[PDB]
Amino acid sequence: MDVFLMIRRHKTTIFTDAKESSTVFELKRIVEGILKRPPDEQRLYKDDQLLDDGKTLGECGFTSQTARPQAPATVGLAFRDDTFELCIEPFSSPPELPDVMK
Amino acid sequence: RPVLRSVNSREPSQVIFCNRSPRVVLPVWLNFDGEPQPYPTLPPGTGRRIHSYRGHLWLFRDAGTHDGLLVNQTELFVPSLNVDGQPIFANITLPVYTLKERCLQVVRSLVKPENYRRLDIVRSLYEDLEDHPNVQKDLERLTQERIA
Amino acid sequence: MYVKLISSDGHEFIVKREHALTSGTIKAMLNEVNFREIPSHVLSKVCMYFTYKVRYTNSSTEIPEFPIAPEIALELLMAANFLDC
Amino acid sequence: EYKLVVVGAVGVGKSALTIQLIQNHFVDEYDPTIEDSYRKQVVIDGETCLLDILDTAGQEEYSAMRDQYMRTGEGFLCVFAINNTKSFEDIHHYREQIKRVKDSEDVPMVLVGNKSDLPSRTVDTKQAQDLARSYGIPFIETSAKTRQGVDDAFYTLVREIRKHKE
Ligand SMILES: Cc1ncsc1-c1ccc(CNC(=O)[C@@H]2C[C@@H](O)CN2C(=O)[C@@H](c2cc(OCCCCN3CCCN(c4nccc(-c5noc([C@@]6(C)CCCc7sc(N)c(C#N)c76)n5)n4)[C@@H](C)C3)no2)C(C)C)cc1
Ligand SMILES: Nc1nc2c(ncn2[C@@H]2O[C@H](COP(=O)(O)OP(=O)(O)O)[C@@H](O)[C@H]2O)c(=O)[nH]1
Numbered sequence: 481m482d483v484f485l486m487i488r489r490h491k492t493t494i495f496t497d498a499k500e501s502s503t504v505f506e507l508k509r510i511v512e513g514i515l516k517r518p519p520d521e522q523r524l525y526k527d528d529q530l531l532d533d534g535k536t537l538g539e540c541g542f543t544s545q546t547a548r549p550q551a552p553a554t555v556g557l558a559f560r561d562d563t564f565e566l567c568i569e570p571f572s573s574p575p576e577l578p579d580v581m582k
Numbered sequence: 583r584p585v586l587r588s589v590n591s592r593e594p595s596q597v598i599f600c601n602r603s604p605r606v607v608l609p610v611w612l613n614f615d616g617e618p619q620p621y622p623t624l625p626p627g628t629g630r631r632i633h634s635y636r637g638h639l640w641l642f643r644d645a646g647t648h649d650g651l652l653v654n655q656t657e658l659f660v661p662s663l664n665v666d667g668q669p670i671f672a673n674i675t676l677p678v679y680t681l682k683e684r685c686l687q688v689v690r691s692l693v694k695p696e697n698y699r700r701l702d703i704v705r706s707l708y709e710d711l712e713d714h715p716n717v718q719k720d721l722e723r724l725t726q727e728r729i730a
Numbered sequence: 731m732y733v734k735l736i737s738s739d740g741h742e743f744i745v746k747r748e749h750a751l752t753s754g755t756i757k758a759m760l761n762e763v764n765f766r767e768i769p770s771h772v773l774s775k776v777c778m779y780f781t782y783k784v785r786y787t788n789s790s791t792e793i794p795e796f797p798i799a800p801e802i803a804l805e806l807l808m809a810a811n812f813l814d815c
Numbered sequence: 816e817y818k819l820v821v822v823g824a825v826g827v828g829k830s831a832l833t834i835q836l837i838q839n840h841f842v843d844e845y846d847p848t849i850e851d852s853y854r855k856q857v858v859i860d861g862e863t864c865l866l867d868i869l870d871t872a873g874q875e876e877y878s879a880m881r882d883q884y885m886r887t888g889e890g891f892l893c894v895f896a897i898n899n900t901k902s903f904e905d906i907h908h909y910r911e912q913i914k915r916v917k918d919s920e921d922v923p924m925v926l927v928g929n930k931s932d933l934p935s936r937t938v939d940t941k942q943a944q945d946l947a948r949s950y951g952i953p954f955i956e957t958s959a960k961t962r963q964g965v966d967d968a969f970y971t972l973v974r975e976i977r978k979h980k981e
């Protein structure tokens with residue numbers, strides 16, 4: 481089983497793929513190699529709750545049925561030198577549906 | 583004589599048409615003179631047992647849009663002869679369309695063909711949008727690809 | 731290996747190299763890319779296409795339809811036209 | 816006005832069963848070349864109808880013309896002889912051509928085993944009913960000389976036809 485996700489923080493969304501049998505921690509290090517930040521400095525928030533590094537991708541609520549490539553489940557990111565901060569800034573919104581497409 | 587045609591083998595071959603797409607499938611048989619003959623459609627997820635013959639060529643399309651579907655991960659199907667009356671399986675599936683051909687698909691299903699030119703899009707897209715999938719033109723291309 | 735794609739709005743979408751190579755227009759241009767005519771909402775679905783194209787190409791089993799919502803369709807078509815994917 | 820159609824390999828008695836239905840006798844050697852449609856009027860199940868029975872004969876022709884004419888049929892009558900095996904085997908091919916011209920998996924038909932009078936049997940009553948189950952069709956054994964069942968078949972076929980219009 482593969483899970484597909486986008487990790488957002490500020491205005492930064494990472495399009496990576498991980499396995500449901502992957503641990504949030506192992507994932508925290510998936511940001512280690514790209515965002516250049518320690519796994520003990522990162523805070524991954526599925527929705528407004530958080531994640532124990534041990535929890536496997538799946539139990540957190542990430543199954544193939546809801547983290548698919550054509551619609552990756554989103555994963556918030558919070559970054560700490562002493563206190564952790566979360567905040568994702570929304571995307572742009574489409575123009576009002578033209579009448580001819582109605 | 584056309585290169586994409588069926589062969590009059592008169593040899594029955596029982597085949598399963600299994601529609602694993604979300605499109606209503608329209609199976610097409612290419613007759614002994616190469617001309618495409620439609621056949622009954624198949625709702626999404628439906629499986630039907632079809633009587634066809636060996637050498638006979640089929641292709642499968644969205645019944646309304648005539649958009650392109652695939653069978654057995656290629657675009658044509660030609661049954662072999664059966665072995666111990668095991669049916670030959672024909673799994674129909676959406677191909678991976680280019681994001682541009684996907685978007686043309688959606689926008690053709692939402693605006694009628696008269697209002698293409700009233701859309702706020704570059705004029706190349708109007709020429710593309712009214713370039714509806716046509717099966718006669720995919721045979722022309724497919725025949726030429728038999729260059730192999 | 732990765733590439734950063736930036737929307738006109740200013741969102742930075744980071745998705746693997748081969749995924750972006752899905753784009754002919756983003757192949758001729760390539761270690762970081764900005765686009766000023768593609769908003770944050772279109773480039774997001776754009777990138778989502780990249781992952782979908784790569785997971786399901788040459789799949790023997792069945793493939794799921796790529797969803798496009800009506801509101802984002804036209805803008806997405808252009809980006810598709812311009813991006814050549 | 817129901818339009819019926821009688822098909823099956825040459826020899827089963829498509830001309831035999833039809834004449835009995837209309838003229839009410841049993842020609843012992845109707846020509847296997849002639850094809851004709853007979854129009855009769857009868858009150859089937861309270862409905863004073865009109866059954867146009869097309870008695871098919873001749874060689875296979877998969878032209879656009881024979882298909883168009885055969886498509887006019889609303890219910891088909893795939894007979895077979897219970898002393899001829901092939902007749903039964905070919906039943907598959909008859910059913911399938913009907914499916915194609917009628918453009919459906921669902922089409923009004925009823926199997927019919929003619930020549931039950933004859934002593935020896937190749938195809939036993941059993942397999943025919945179960946194959947009929949495979950399709951969805953009422954099976955009806957029939958005899959053209961003894962006349963048995965001739966009517967029922969020709970009636971039950973039209974019951975299905977009426978059902979299709981619901
Ligand atoms: C349900 C569904 N959902 C989605 S798709 C679908 C679906 C629906 C239907 C089908 C049916 N499949 C086909 O259409 C397949 C598929 C593709 O492969 C091409 N194809 C074919 O059949 C093609 C083909 C056939 C073929 O014959 C080779 C084998 C023939 C060999 N002959 C040898 C002599 C004995 N003998 C015979 N002797 C005399 C007469 C007849 C006869 N036979 O009929 C009819 C009648 C009078 C009966 C009433 C109905 C209609 S109508 C019409 N014109 C009729 C006529 N003359 C008839 N008398 N028979 C046959 C039993 C066997 N070689 O090529 C052509 C004909 C189309 C398949 C899929
Ligand atoms: N015993 C018996 N013989 C039949 C019956 N029906 C037809 N026959 C004979 O078998 C052949 C049937 O001929 P016909 O009705 O022309 O068959 P067609 O080929 O189906 O037109 C003729 O030789 C008839 O004499 C039947 O019900 N019982």
Ligand SMILES: [Mg+2]
Nearest residue numbers: 830846847872
């Ligand atoms: Mg006759």
